[PDB]
Scaffold this active site. Structure first.
Site, PDB file in Angstrom:
ATOM      1  N   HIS A  49      21.422  69.932  11.683  1.00 58.96           N
ATOM      2  CA  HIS A  49      21.206  69.165  12.900  1.00 58.96           C
ATOM      3  C   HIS A  49      22.465  69.020  13.739  1.00 58.96           C
ATOM      4  O   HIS A  49      23.218  68.066  13.556  1.00 58.96           O
ATOM      5  CB  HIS A  49      20.676  67.773  12.532  1.00 58.96           C
ATOM      6  CG  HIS A  49      20.057  67.043  13.676  1.00 58.96           C
ATOM      7  ND1 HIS A  49      19.263  65.931  13.508  1.00 58.96           N
ATOM      8  CD2 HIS A  49      20.112  67.264  15.012  1.00 58.96           C
ATOM      9  CE1 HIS A  49      18.853  65.496  14.686  1.00 58.96           C
ATOM     10  NE2 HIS A  49      19.353  66.288  15.615  1.00 58.96           N
ATOM     11  N   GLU A 115      14.103  69.805  17.831  1.00 60.06           N
ATOM     12  CA  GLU A 115      14.017  68.353  17.839  1.00 60.06           C
ATOM     13  C   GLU A 115      13.285  68.001  19.119  1.00 60.06           C
ATOM     14  O   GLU A 115      13.848  68.064  20.200  1.00 60.06           O
ATOM     15  CB  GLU A 115      15.408  67.717  17.865  1.00 60.06           C
ATOM     16  CG  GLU A 115      15.418  66.264  17.368  1.00 60.06           C
ATOM     17  CD  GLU A 115      16.597  65.471  17.873  1.00 60.06           C
ATOM     18  OE1 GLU A 115      17.762  65.888  17.713  1.00 60.06           O
ATOM     19  OE2 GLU A 115      16.357  64.402  18.447  1.00 60.06           O
ATOM     20  N   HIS A 197      17.505  61.924  11.260  1.00 64.87           N
ATOM     21  CA  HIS A 197      18.540  60.889  11.422  1.00 64.87           C
ATOM     22  C   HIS A 197      18.040  59.456  11.231  1.00 64.87           C
ATOM     23  O   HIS A 197      17.820  58.704  12.184  1.00 64.87           O
ATOM     24  CB  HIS A 197      19.361  61.043  12.724  1.00 64.87           C
ATOM     25  CG  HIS A 197      18.548  61.134  13.970  1.00 64.87           C
ATOM     26  ND1 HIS A 197      17.413  60.387  14.177  1.00 64.87           N
ATOM     27  CD2 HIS A 197      18.711  61.889  15.083  1.00 64.87           C
ATOM     28  CE1 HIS A 197      16.907  60.681  15.362  1.00 64.87           C
ATOM     29  NE2 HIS A 197      17.675  61.591  15.931  1.00 64.87           N
ATOM     30  N   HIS A 232      26.157  55.292  14.228  1.00 65.77           N
ATOM     31  CA  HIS A 232      24.706  55.435  14.049  1.00 65.77           C
ATOM     32  C   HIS A 232      24.231  54.566  12.879  1.00 65.77           C
ATOM     33  O   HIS A 232      23.081  54.122  12.851  1.00 65.77           O
ATOM     34  CB  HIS A 232      24.322  56.890  13.830  1.00 65.77           C
ATOM     35  CG  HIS A 232      24.364  57.709  15.083  1.00 65.77           C
ATOM     36  ND1 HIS A 232      25.547  58.095  15.679  1.00 65.77           N
ATOM     37  CD2 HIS A 232      23.373  58.140  15.897  1.00 65.77           C
ATOM     38  CE1 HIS A 232      25.282  58.723  16.807  1.00 65.77           C
ATOM     39  NE2 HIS A 232      23.971  58.763  16.963  1.00 65.77           N
ATOM     40  N   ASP A 255      24.672  65.920  14.200  1.00 58.20           N
ATOM     41  CA  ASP A 255      24.002  65.476  15.428  1.00 58.20           C
ATOM     42  C   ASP A 255      25.043  65.507  16.542  1.00 58.20           C
ATOM     43  O   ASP A 255      24.984  64.762  17.516  1.00 58.20           O
ATOM     44  CB  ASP A 255      23.420  64.059  15.261  1.00 58.20           C
ATOM     45  CG  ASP A 255      22.469  63.637  16.431  1.00 58.20           C
ATOM     46  OD1 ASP A 255      21.581  64.420  16.866  1.00 58.20           O
ATOM     47  OD2 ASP A 255      22.598  62.482  16.903  1.00 58.20           O
ATOM     48  N   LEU A 288      22.609  55.521  22.173  1.00 62.00           N
ATOM     49  CA  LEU A 288      23.458  56.551  21.586  1.00 62.00           C
ATOM     50  C   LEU A 288      22.864  57.899  21.992  1.00 62.00           C
ATOM     51  O   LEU A 288      21.640  58.067  22.003  1.00 62.00           O
ATOM     52  CB  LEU A 288      23.484  56.446  20.059  1.00 62.00           C
ATOM     53  CG  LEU A 288      24.280  55.255  19.500  1.00 62.00           C
ATOM     54  CD1 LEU A 288      24.030  55.158  17.991  1.00 62.00           C
ATOM     55  CD2 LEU A 288      25.772  55.398  19.832  1.00 62.00           C
TER      56      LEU A 288
HETATM   57 FE   LIG Z   1      17.311  62.464  18.046  1.00 64.22          FE
END
Ligand SMILES: [Fe+3]
Ligand SMILES: [Fe+3]
Lengths: 363, 363
Positions: A49, A115, A197, A232, A255, A288
């Site tokens: 990711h 995603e 996530h 996060h 990410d 975020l």
């Molecule tokens: Fe996302």
């Protein structure tokens, strides 16, 4: 061809000093030898990711740039991840990655992680609301190799069609959803065993409706990807997820976006403006918008937050993903497997990366 | 003065077939004897959190009625529990509880659990906002035996003053609070290791701020009350907490009110109106207001929800509370301990309970 006097770290056999023998991209000998270690040797990291990094994005298909940098983070397998977008962009990104893989048969690019766009608008966070939509029979037909993973919201309309993708060597992952525990379970019973996530983009855990977050913690064989940037999730949260899920149920992820490794500037994600202050990228409204976390930092962070062993860090940094993605000869330092390895100093700073028995990075 | 050929279950010594000798209210001999079990013998159940039951209410100081009925639930130790109230009604309740204990020396009433009024208004549940207020040097002088437990919110003003009650043989417990993880730690560092009916009345778990809910899952020696009526916590939630905390971290509780055991209708709890539907009491706006769970069902539900062992059931239904309360002589089936016992059939229904060597209930 041979790495000696190292702290060898295998997710299954544990950690021990010895030497590893590589024959044309294949580990042919792992010898446990009692001596004093030179550094740490672990399976090549896997990032399933990541959107972009140091100026390169998946939206512009800068695979070559992404790949080359990732080696400096010890990453030997990655999935260029998209954000919600048009069926058009999608086909083009899948097409260029497919051509890129054909042109560089030994690349770290496994494929594409889609995603969105089949997510919940209520937990869209950073995704362009305009592209978010339910899956259709017409679009389902454009999703195939090189797609390798797909993040969807189980409660969305026609979410069930997505199940037809698993037979195409595509891993399904739940995220950006408000689905209840039972709605997620409809998919868990069919083999969906991963959460994107965690726990960002999900309804929280409540006293009676535990939801996806609760399913994620409750179900022992559902893995959770975690962004270990301290933002996060706080160090306490990470410590909690680790406590509940153990190393076996966590997948490290970056990410990361194109901004990672660049001055606090001002770019965008797909078709949305993002501001980056102190490394933390967020939309104007505060949401975020990915991270600037380098995979290498992810490992150090996780290790510090939890105090886990280097053997457990191997599971969260590579082995767990390998198991999800069906990469049976990766994520290990055992005889018979692929020589994708990363050598580090005791503080876990990357000092050398090997992809298919070839050194692709030295610091 | 002998119960023989039963399946004895000690929290610490595990389960085994045997005979128990009781003499003058004391367990004098426990002997392992092979043979097929008559029934199941366990230490007497302990309920530290119960307001009322079958028309009997702590606020009306119906101690006698409560004691009698609880015996049919195998409960040999309980804490009559208040709700937020005036300093006045609080002194009266403590005054009558004191009188009741002096007059019935071998009673199951250990004392009073003061739930409120030192809680937060954001999480008052069914508490009347009018009595919630911060503690004070003066109000604290009025709190002592038979008070044995106090639930308070760590973020409330002057909350630190409550730490002095500990040396008066009073257990502090966190609840009805929007306290952050760190505000909670200040108290954890000072010895507060208990949370009241987790996680109802607490801020939810969030990605960065794990709050008290997070603290309670993460910290190992912090015990949590659980109301297993299938409503305050779904069976999935109970399975989650069990998985994370294990039997050692759970204290079964009823949180039963007056309406328990009576037909649906409308009653009160403190100064407020309550509606009971399908045995679920709620305030006009749906807020849960205590429960109608019988301790006996509580024990059966926990086992069904978790699939735990009979030995573990003993820890959650008795021993853990005895440990927290300092009842060194209770919650055990061992030589030298008090003869407070429950004998159940194999479907875990209560067939007989004993308080201080005296049989106080037969089905
Ligand atoms: Fe996302
Ligand atoms: Fe309460």
């Amino acid at each position: 061809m041979i790495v000696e006097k190292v702290l060898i770290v295998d997710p299954i056999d544990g950690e021990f000093t010895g030497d590893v023998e590589i024959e044309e991209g294949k580990i042919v000998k792992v010898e446990k030898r009692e001596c004093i270690p030179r550094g740490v040797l672990m399976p090549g990291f896997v990032d399933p990711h990541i959107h972009g990094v140091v100026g390169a994005d998946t939206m512009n298909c800068d695979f070559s740039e992404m790949e080359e940098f990732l080696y400096s983070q010890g990453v030997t397998t990655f999935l260029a991840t998209t954000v919600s977008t048009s069926l058009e962009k999608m086909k083009e990104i899948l097409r260029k990655a497919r051509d890129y893989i054909l042109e560089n048969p030994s690349t770290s690019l496994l494929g594409v992680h889609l995603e969105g766009p089949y997510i919940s608008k209520e937990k869209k966070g950073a995704h362009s609301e305009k592209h978010i939509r339910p899956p259709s029979e017409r679009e389902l037909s454009e999703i195939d190799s090189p797609a390798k993973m797909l993040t969807f919201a189980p409660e969305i309309e026609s979410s069930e069609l997505l199940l037809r993708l698993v037979k195409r060597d595509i891993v399904l992952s739940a995220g950006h959803s408000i689905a209840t525990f039972e709605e997620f379970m409809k998919f868990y019973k069919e083999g969906v065993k991963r959460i994107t996530h965690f726990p960002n983009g999900l309804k929280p855990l409540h006293h009676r409706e535990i939801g996806i977050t609760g399913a994620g913690l409750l179900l022992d064989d559902v893995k959770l990807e975690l962004i270990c940037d301290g933002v996060h999730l706080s160090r306490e949260m990470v410590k909690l997820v680790y406590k509940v899920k153990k190393a076996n149920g966590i997948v490290l992820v970056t990410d990361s976006i194109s901004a990672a490794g660049l001055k606090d500037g001002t770019t965008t994600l797909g078709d949305l403006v993002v501001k980056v202050k102190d490394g933390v990228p967020r939309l104007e409204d505060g949401t975020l918008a990915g991270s600037t976390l380098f995979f290498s930092q992810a490992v150090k962070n996780f290790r510090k937050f939890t105090g886990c062993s280097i053997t457990e860090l191997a599971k969260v940094s590579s082995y767990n993903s390998c198991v999800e993605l069906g990469l049976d000869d990766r994520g290990r330092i055992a005889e018979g497997t692929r020589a994708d390895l990363v050598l580090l100093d005791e503080d876990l700073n990357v000092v050398m990366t090997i992809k298919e028995g070839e050194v692709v990075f030295r610091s």
